[PDB]
Amino acid sequence: LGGPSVFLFPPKPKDTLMISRTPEVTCVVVDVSQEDPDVKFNWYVNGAEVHHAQTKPRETQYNSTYRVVSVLTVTHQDWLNGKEYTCKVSNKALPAPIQKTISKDKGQPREPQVYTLPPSREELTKNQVSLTCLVKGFYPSDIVVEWESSGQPENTYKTTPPVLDSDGSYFLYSKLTVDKSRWQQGNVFSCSVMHEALHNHYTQKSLSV
Amino acid sequence: PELLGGPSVFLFPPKPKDTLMISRTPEVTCVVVDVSQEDPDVKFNWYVNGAEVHHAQTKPRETQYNSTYRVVSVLTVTHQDWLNGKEYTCKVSNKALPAPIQKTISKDKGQPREPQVYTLPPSREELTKNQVSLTCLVKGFYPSDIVVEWESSGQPENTYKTTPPVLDSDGSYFLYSKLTVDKSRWQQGNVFSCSVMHEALHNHYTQKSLSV
Amino acid sequence: DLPKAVVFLEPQWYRVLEKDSVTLKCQGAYSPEDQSTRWFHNESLISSQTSSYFIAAARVNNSGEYRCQTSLSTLSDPVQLEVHIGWLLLQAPRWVFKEEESIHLRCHSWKNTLLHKVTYLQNGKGRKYFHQNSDFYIPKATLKDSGSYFCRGLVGSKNVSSETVQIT
Numbered sequence: 001l002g003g004p005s006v007f008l009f010p011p012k013p014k015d016t017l018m019i020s021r022t023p024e025v026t027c028v029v030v031d032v033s034q035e036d037p038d039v040k041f042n043w044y045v046n047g048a049e050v051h052h053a054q055t056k057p058r059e060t061q062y063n064s065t066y067r068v069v070s071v072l073t074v075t076h077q078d079w080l081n082g083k084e085y086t087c088k089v090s091n092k093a094l095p096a097p098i099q100k101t102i103s104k105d106k107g108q109p110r111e112p113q114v115y116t117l118p119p120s121r122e123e124l125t126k127n128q129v130s131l132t133c134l135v136k137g138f139y140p141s142d143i144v145v146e147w148e149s150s151g152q153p154e155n156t157y158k159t160t161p162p163v164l165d166s167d168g169s170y171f172l173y174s175k176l177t178v179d180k181s182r183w184q185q186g187n188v189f190s191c192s193v194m195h196e197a198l199h200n201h202y203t204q205k206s207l208s209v
Numbered sequence: 210p211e212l213l214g215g216p217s218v219f220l221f222p223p224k225p226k227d228t229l230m231i232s233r234t235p236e237v238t239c240v241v242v243d244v245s246q247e248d249p250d251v252k253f254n255w256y257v258n259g260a261e262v263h264h265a266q267t268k269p270r271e272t273q274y275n276s277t278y279r280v281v282s283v284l285t286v287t288h289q290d291w292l293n294g295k296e297y298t299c300k301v302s303n304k305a306l307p308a309p310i311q312k313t314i315s316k317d318k319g320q321p322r323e324p325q326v327y328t329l330p331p332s333r334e335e336l337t338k339n340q341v342s343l344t345c346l347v348k349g350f351y352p353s354d355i356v357v358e359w360e361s362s363g364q365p366e367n368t369y370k371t372t373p374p375v376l377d378s379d380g381s382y383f384l385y386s387k388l389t390v391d392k393s394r395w396q397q398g399n400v401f402s403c404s405v406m407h408e409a410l411h412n413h414y415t416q417k418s419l420s421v
Numbered sequence: 422d423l424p425k426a427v428v429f430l431e432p433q434w435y436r437v438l439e440k441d442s443v444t445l446k447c448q449g450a451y452s453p454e455d456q457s458t459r460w461f462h463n464e465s466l467i468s469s470q471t472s473s474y475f476i477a478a479a480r481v482n483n484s485g486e487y488r489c490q491t492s493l494s495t496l497s498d499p500v501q502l503e504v505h506i507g508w509l510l511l512q513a514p515r516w517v518f519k520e521e522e523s524i525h526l527r528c529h530s531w532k533n534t535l536l537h538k539v540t541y542l543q544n545g546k547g548r549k550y551f552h553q554n555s556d557f558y559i560p561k562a563t564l565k566d567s568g569s570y571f572c573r574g575l576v577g578s579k580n581v582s583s584e585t586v587q588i589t
């Protein structure tokens with residue numbers, strides 16, 4: 001049969017990595033009726049009901065159905081150590097509470113070495129050149145590849161989704177477009193990645209010519 | 210076991226290597242799943258804008274795991290009938306469905322430009338290792354379904370693993386391929402090639418090989 | 422002239438499904454001494470003979486326009502019958518609704534199949550969601566309806582929608 005449905009989502013990596021953005025794990029109840037609502041979240045963190053569970057209102061959805069979201073503020077360390085977080089919801093529509101649990105990719109890590117390729121000499125024929133940031137064999141999928149210029153960000157880049165290599169490690173190529181005028185003047189462009197297997201969770205190489 | 214509720218149908222296109230290259234048999238496939246204890250039968254009807262069912266030859270029902278006899282049937286295509294842009298429909302019908310469900314796939318539309326193909330060499334700092342990574346950047350094409358292969362003169366290494374096409378900032382796709390070979394072959398002095406197959410490519414082939 | 426007979430829809434939905442069952446009734450006379458109803462399909466004559474037409478499996482060659490008339494009761498008036506085929510079906514009593522009345526919408530299934538997570542929409546946006554299958558009684562006309570009203574469900578795992586119906 002059917003009823004309300006729960007979706008447990010992990011923190012977005014840039015939050016958990018880099019101590020400056022609190023990391024939250026959002027629990028989303030969906031298809032929650034208007035008659036028969038009142039959803040009760042029973043949060044669990046490695047065996048502790050943890051009553052800092054901050055929930056939210058009843059969201060208004062085209063399909064009349066309601067949608068409730070509750071964010072639990074997490075710790076940067078407790079996520080990475082491997083504590084298992086867990087949502088348990090009940091509603092008079094559910095004849096047995098629906099519980100689902102998550103806890104970060106539990107598997108043996110690896111380091112991402114960050115190599116940085118340059119434009120091909122023919123591309124310098126085009127109107128804008130493409131700078132490549134290679135990120136070889138790492139673990140796990142979560143990662144934060146980003147480009148920067150001189151001082152602050154560059155947002156003219158598109159990054160390949162993580163691929164699975166022959167050994168079981170994840171590589172990914174980011175790429176960023178730039179004015180041939182801007183690349184030939186000699187501005188230095190730095191590629192910064194953030195993974196849970198890099199001391200201080202932050203390596204960053206640089207490219208020029 | 211089962212639980213039932215009304216069968217389903219999935220239609221997949223032909224593999225690009227079979228479309229962009231001749232004397233390859235390219236195909237359209239009708240995967241029908243979730244038939245059950247009712248023993249729902251075959252009945253497959255393929256169309257191009259109304260058509261004949263000669264390229265058909267349904268297979269045998271196979272259940273494997275979950276006790277729902279998978280049924281599949283595959284339709285052969287001319288490499289030229291694709292690409293220009295036909296349609297191809299299924300209309301499969303089961304004695305446990307209201308009205309025969311049907312799906313069509315056709316080709317992707319849209320202006321196809323030719324894929325550029327740049328070739329990138331091992332990173333400066335990547336030479337401090339027994340294994341380097343040759344990189345091939347295929348940027349600027351449209352119809353995603355592209356083929357990328359590597360080779361050394363006349364041998365095909367499965368060393369490479371390639372990124373799936375990723376949408377760029379102008380509707381064109383770009384991808385990356387990585388080939389990890391022992392440095393020796395690199396510095397030693399070999400020539401490695403990145404062949405690219407795209408309907409927007411002269412003879413559907415271009416390779417921008419590289420060496421030190 | 423004499424009293425008109427009337428056709429009664431059992432149930433009250435003039436939209437059916439290629440496997441749903443309808444039964445038609447006729448009151449007008451009750452043919453005092455001896456009953457007989459004479460039934461009319463698309464302007465013709467069925468040999469039903471009883472006071473009730475029995476349509477177990479509805480199937481297109483069963484739609485059209487219907488009429489009846491017992492041992493008196495003149496001749497019945499024209500009642501329409503549609504027979505769509507599909508999964509969902511937004512059944513209704515009638516569709517002409519002005520001023521202000523009360524509507525009793527139904528999101529029918531097919532071969533009495535269950536329908537999880539049912540929704541009713543107002544020419545796009547929904548208005549009343551239900552977890553299990555039930556009708557959508559709306560009382561006291563909204564004064565702003567009159568857009569395409571359809572419903573969507575879940576027949577096991579299949580994502581099924583309904584063919585639209587315009588009300589006013």
Ligand SMILES: *[C@@H]1O[C@H](CO[C@@H]2O[C@@H](C)[C@@H](O)[C@@H](O)[C@@H]2O)[C@@H](O[C@@H]2O[C@H](CO)[C@@H](O[C@@H]3O[C@H](CO[C@H]4O[C@H](CO)[C@@H](O)[C@H](O)[C@@H]4O[C@@H]4O[C@H](CO)[C@@H](O)[C@H](O)[C@H]4NC(C)=O)[C@@H](O)[C@H](O[C@H]4O[C@H](CO)[C@@H](O)[C@H](O)[C@@H]4O[C@@H]4O[C@H](CO)[C@@H](O)[C@H](O)[C@H]4NC(C)=O)[C@@H]3O)[C@H](O)[C@H]2NC(C)=O)[C@H](O)[C@H]1NC(C)=O
Nearest residue numbers: 007009012026028030031061062063065067538539540550
């Ligand atoms: C009524 O309407 C509401 C909402 O309206 C609509 O909402 C969306 C869908 C749009 O269409 C809007 O235009 C519109 O307003 C409906 O609510 C929706 O219900 C569906 C399911 O019924 C949900 O789908 C699920 O989505 C999750 C992921 O959802 C993220 O990504 C969505 C698209 O990118 C996005 O819309 C979501 O909001 C959410 O976005 C993320 O949010 C977090 C939290 O803030 C944020 O940090 C993220 O950054 C953000 N994402 C991004 C990219 O930024 C999806 O994962 C679910 O898939 C699981 O389940 C599937 C079903 O089996 C399965 O196929 C998948 O593989 C996956 O399965 C699980 O995967 C893992 C790995 O194995 C594991 O846990 C399980 O083993 C596995 N299997 C199962 C069974 O769990 C799923 O598809 C929508 O999210 C939800 N919309 C919401 C919540 O906003 C509602 O259904 C409507 N009802 C009716 C009756 O009409």
Ligand SMILES: *[C@@H]1O[C@H](CO[C@@H]2O[C@@H](C)[C@@H](O)[C@@H](O)[C@@H]2O)[C@@H](O[C@@H]2O[C@H](CO)[C@@H](O[C@@H]3O[C@H](CO[C@H]4O[C@H](CO)[C@@H](O)[C@H](O)[C@@H]4O[C@@H]4O[C@H](CO)[C@@H](O)[C@H](O)[C@H]4NC(C)=O)[C@@H](O)[C@H](O[C@H]4O[C@H](CO)[C@@H](O)[C@H](O)[C@@H]4O[C@@H]4O[C@H](CO)[C@@H](O)[C@H](O)[C@H]4NC(C)=O)[C@@H]3O)[C@H](O)[C@H]2NC(C)=O)[C@H](O)[C@H]1NC(C)=O
Nearest residue numbers: 217218219220221222224238240242243274275277279281
């Ligand atoms: C009972 O029996 C089997 C059990 O097999 C099971 O297989 C997997 C799933 C595991 O769970 C195993 O443990 C288990 O044994 C089930 O049969 C399968 O059922 C699933 C879902 O019901 C189907 O999944 C669909 O798969 C397509 C893609 O399918 C290709 O790739 C799969 C891997 O990605 C592969 O498994 C398939 O075999 C198939 O592979 C292709 O095979 C052909 C020939 O065999 C070959 O020529 C191709 O080259 C090859 N392709 C590749 C890449 O290798 C996937 O696309 C479907 O997604 C649709 O549905 C989603 C949710 O509805 C939706 O989000 C998607 O967008 C998509 O929906 C469509 O989307 C587009 C637009 O967005 C559009 O077409 C439509 O609008 C929309 N809807 C539809 C209907 O098309 C989907 O995930 C399997 O194909 C199927 N058969 C298999 C695996 O052989 C069965 O489900 C079991 N019962 C239950 C209850 O689970």
Ligand SMILES: *[C@@H]1O[C@H](CO)[C@@H](O[C@@H]2O[C@H](CO)[C@@H](O[C@@H]3O[C@H](CO)[C@@H](O)[C@H](O[C@H]4O[C@H](CO)[C@@H](O)[C@H](O)[C@@H]4O)[C@@H]3O)[C@H](O)[C@H]2NC(C)=O)[C@H](O)[C@H]1NC(C)=O
Nearest residue numbers: 462463464465480481482483484485486487501502503504
């Ligand atoms: C009383 O009148 C009603 C109408 O007022 C009438 O209902 C009609 O019956 C016919 C009989 O089939 C239906 O015709 C179908 O029309 C659809 C369009 O929706 C077509 O797609 C169909 O074509 C198929 O049928 C042929 C035979 O299977 C195939 O050879 C052909 O290739 C197609 O596959 C089909 O012709 C019609 O939809 C209904 N409804 C109407 C017209 O509103 C009813 O039959 C009359 N009473 C009696 C006793 O017949």
Ligand SMILES: *[C@@H]1O[C@H](CO)[C@@H](O)[C@H](O)[C@H]1NC(C)=O
Nearest residue numbers: 462463465480481482483485
């Ligand atoms: C029943 O349907 C078929 C479909 O065209 C038709 O040949 C036949 O005449 C129909 N029966 C009647 C009574 O109309």
Ligand SMILES: *[C@@H]1O[C@H](CO)[C@@H](O)[C@H](O)[C@H]1NC(C)=O
Nearest residue numbers: 063538540573574580581582
């Ligand atoms: C499937 O049904 C849902 C309603 O639950 C609807 O929002 C969605 O549009 C349907 N599928 C697709 C592919 O749109």
